[PDB]
Amino acid sequence: GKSPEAECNKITEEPKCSEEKICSWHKEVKAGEKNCQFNSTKASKS
Numbered sequence: 001g002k003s004p005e006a007e008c009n010k011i012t013e014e015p016k017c018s019e020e021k022i023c024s025w026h027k028e029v030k031a032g033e034k035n036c037q038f039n040s041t042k043a044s045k046s
Contacts, residue, residue, distance in 0.1 A: 005038035012036050 001007070008023035017025045017036035024039030 003038075008036050008038050009034050010036075 004022050008017060008020060011017045011020055011023060013036065014025045014027075017023045020036070022039060022043040023036060024042055026033060026035045026037050029035050
C-alpha cells in the first residue's frame with residue numbers, strides 16, 4: 001500500500017493488471033522495464 005507504481009509492479013499479470021486500479025499492462029517491455037506498472041493519469045477514474 002505504498003506508491004501506486006510499486007503497487008502495480010507486484011501484479012505481474014496482464015488480466016489482473018489491466019483491471020487493476022490505476023494500473024496498466026506494459027505489453028512490450030525493454031529488458032529492465034516492468035509490464036505491470038503505474039499508468040499515471042491514464043486511468044482518470046474515481
